[PDB]
Structure formats: C-alpha cells, structure tokens
Amino acid sequence: VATTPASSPVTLAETGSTLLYPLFNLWGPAFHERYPNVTITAQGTGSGAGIAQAAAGTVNIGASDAYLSEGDMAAHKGLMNIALAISAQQVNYNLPGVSEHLKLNGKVLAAMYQGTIKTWDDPQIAALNPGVNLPGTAVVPLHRSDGSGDTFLFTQYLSKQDPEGWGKSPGFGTTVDFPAVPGALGENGNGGMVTGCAETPGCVAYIGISFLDQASQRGLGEAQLGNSSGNFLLPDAQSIQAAAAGFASKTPANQAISMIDGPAPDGYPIINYEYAIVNNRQKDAATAQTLQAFLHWAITDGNKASFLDQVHFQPLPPAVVKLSDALIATISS
Numbered sequence: 001v002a003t004t005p006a007s008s009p010v011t012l013a014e015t016g017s018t019l020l021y022p023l024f025n026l027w028g029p030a031f032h033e034r035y036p037n038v039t040i041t042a043q044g045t046g047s048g049a050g051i052a053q054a055a056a057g058t059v060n061i062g063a064s065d066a067y068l069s070e071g072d073m074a075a076h077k078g079l080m081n082i083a084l085a086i087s088a089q090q091v092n093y094n095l096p097g098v099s100e101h102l103k104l105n106g107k108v109l110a111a112m113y114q115g116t117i118k119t120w121d122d123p124q125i126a127a128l129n130p131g132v133n134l135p136g137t138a139v140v141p142l143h144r145s146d147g148s149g150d151t152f153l154f155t156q157y158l159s160k161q162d163p164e165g166w167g168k169s170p171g172f173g174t175t176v177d178f179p180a181v182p183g184a185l186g187e188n189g190n191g192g193m194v195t196g197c198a199e200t201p202g203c204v205a206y207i208g209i210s211f212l213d214q215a216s217q218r219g220l221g222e223a224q225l226g227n228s229s230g231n232f233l234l235p236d237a238q239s240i241q242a243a244a245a246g247f248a249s250k251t252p253a254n255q256a257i258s259m260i261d262g263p264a265p266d267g268y269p270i271i272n273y274e275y276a277i278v279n280n281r282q283k284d285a286a287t288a289q290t291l292q293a294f295l296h297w298a299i300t301d302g303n304k305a306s307f308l309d310q311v312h313f314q315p316l317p318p319a320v321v322k323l324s325d326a327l328i329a330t331i332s333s
Contacts (some may be wrong), residue, residue, distance in 0.1 A: 001329040005035045005293040006286035012294060014042040016050020016063030017149050018189040019087060019208035020274045023311045024063065027302050031294055038290055044189060048147015048174045054277040055079055060291055062277035065149025065208070066174050067256035078280035082327045083255045083273035084298055086244055086314040087209055088235040089153050090270075092194070092220040094203045095120060095135060101234060103128045105226030106161025106261070106269075112204060113141045113158070114166070115181030120202065128226075137202040138183070142193060145186030147174040149272075150193075153260065154206035157225075157270050160261040194218060209235055210311035229265040236268075240314050243267025248317040255323055273320075274313070280330050288333040295328045 014024055021044035028040035047064040054062025055076045067081045091104060108124050111117040117124060121134035144151045155172035170177045178184050187196040190211045197203040198218040207215055212235075216222070224232040233239040246262035261269045276295060282288035303315040316324065 001296050001325050002289045002292040003296055005038050005290040007037060008286050009037045009039070010287055010290040011039040011041065012061060012287075012291060013059040014040065014061035014063055015045050015053050015059045016043075016061075016277070017047045017065050017274065018044035018191065019047075019065050019149060019210055020063040020084075022210045023085070023274075023307065023313065026307055026310060027298055030302075030307075031297055035293075038294070040294070044191075046144070046146040046189060047149030047152065050149075051174070051277055052147070054279065057279065060278065060282070060287070064275045064277050065272050066152035067258075067273075067275060068277065073254075076279075079277065080280060080327055080330075081255055081275040081277050082295065082324045083251075083316055083320055084276050084295075084324070085274050085303060085308060085316060086240065086271055087274050087311075088240055088268055088271045089150055089206055089208055090212060090215075090235050091223040091225060092197055092205050092207050092215045093223065094197050094199075094201045094219075095137065095221055096201055096219065098132070098135070098221060100129065100132050101222055101224045102132070103226065103232045104223045105232075106157050106166075109204075110158045110162040110166040112139050113143075113181070113184070114179050115184075118182075140183035140185065140200060140203045141178075141181065142183075142185055142187055142196050142203055142205040143176075143178045144193065145188050149174060150190065150206055150208050151176055153270055153272055156258055156260045161228075194220070209313070212312055225269050227265075227267060227269045228261055228263060231265060233266070233268045235270070235312075237314065239266060239268035240271050243269070243271045244314060244317065248319060251320050251323060253323060253326070255320075255327070273316070278331065280332065282331060282333045284333050288331050292328050292331050295331075296325060299324050299328075
C-alpha cells in the first residue's frame, strides 16, 4: 500500500453519500494541508450517484453507505467497496410537545410506511410507549427521492424485522418503490429529509447520524429503536460500539456485509460501514498512488476521534482496517 502521494499535482474527485459528505469536508482539507499538491473535491449527491459515477469512471471516489450488490460487482469488474468508518441512522419525527424518545421497531415502522398505521396514537404505538400522551396527529412517512444509502439501510431494517411483510415487498435497495399511501412524499438528500420533517408535525424520516445535530436543532424528536434482543436503543457511541462487536470478526474479504439488526443485546440496530466505491484501475501511476495514499490516510489518521467524533462515527476495528488496506493496495494503472 502506498502511504505517500505522488509529488505532481493530482486532483481526487469524490461524489455521493450525503451521509459521508460532512466528513469528507474535514478529511479533504486536512489531507490537502499536508500535501498541497493534492486537490480533493466532494459533493453531496446521494449513494446512488456515488455508485453510478464511480462505475462510469466519472469520479475517483464514489461515496456510498450501501455495499455493491453481487450484480453490481458482476457488471463492473474492477469495482470494489472499501470500508472507511462506521456510521448509523436514526429515525426522527415531528411531534411538538412530546418530550420522550418514542420507542419504535421495524414492525411498527413498516406499518407506518405501508399506510396501516395512520395516526400517532395508534394502538401499536401506545403499546410500546405506556404513559405517554400520544396525539392523534396523522403520520406522514417521508422517503428519499434520490438513490440513497440511507434508503438502503432503512429498508433493510424494515425487511429484517418484517420478513413476511416488507421483506417480501418492496424489499430493500438504494431506490425502492415506496407504497403509495397518503403522505408518501419524497425529499432530496438528508438535508431535505430534515427540512421536510420539520415542516409539518406528524412527519417521520430516516436520517443519517451526521445530520443528528441539525435535526435536533430543528426540534425533531429522536426514536429509540428496538433491536432483536428486545432492547430499545438511541444511536450513540455505546450502542454503536456494542453493535459493531457483532461483526468485527465476521467481515468478508470484499467487505460487503450488512450489519443491520445484529445480535448484540446492547447494540443499535442500524449501523453500517461507510464505503469508498473505487475502481481497481486508475488513469495513471501518479493518480493511483495518490488515491492509495489518501484512502490509507483516511482509515488511519482519518479515523482519529478528532475527525469522527464531529459526525458521530466510530473507527474501523483493526481487523477491518487490514482488509481495507488489502483492497487499497490493488489500486493500479
């Protein structure tokens, strides 16, 4: 693995995951400060564009919260997903006056997105939140309009917890045919989800953890999500470090692994690796070497708390760092 960038000016273009975007805005300047000859550009366009453009050769780095499907790998040989850090997703809602962190699970959320739960005081919700005065506000299940990693993560949670329902249809993916129910409205990017949700009381939205602060500032509630052990957790360092322990020794060599709804009793149900989608063959030697240098930097120096703590991510455990490096090292020209 090349740990030093070429000396000639090189530009690494990135695009994709709005979830990973805030972090790339920190990494980019830091690396550039260290190696002035290297220019890093990034844009928040959603995981879909990330996968699409990296595959088309339009950018050097596609950012994605979703791993490549077996189909994607077969269609674009040389394309791989390298883990860079661990992140998570929370479920925000707009219910002014409700102080508590409402408890929800994949079964109840699937019902909301399927239109069977139409109000916030529905029996299925009250059963999970005894003592809370739930309003009769109508539920408005919002979803991402653009191909999104958050959609992939959310719909996998729903699919795992509701195998016979959501699991069968519409299943999961970066783009999903959401049930056409009242309020099934589309919003662009995580920002759009925050903004959309804050707009009208009763909204529900799956939003990436790096937008947690913004969501709170807008006065949105944050749900406690139930895991398979019957526990309801908030996404924080503790619950994510606990959920990751479930897959630290079980990550495949190609790193395509779902860490959704794991077995850790105290683990948060929606965590995931953030991926750099990159092609095994680059423009020239200088560019291949610089991309390697940057990616290895990102998973070592870039994984320090000074960086990750700002967007609420956790670092990759060592065995995984090793696997990423092994993939970084195949980047040639």
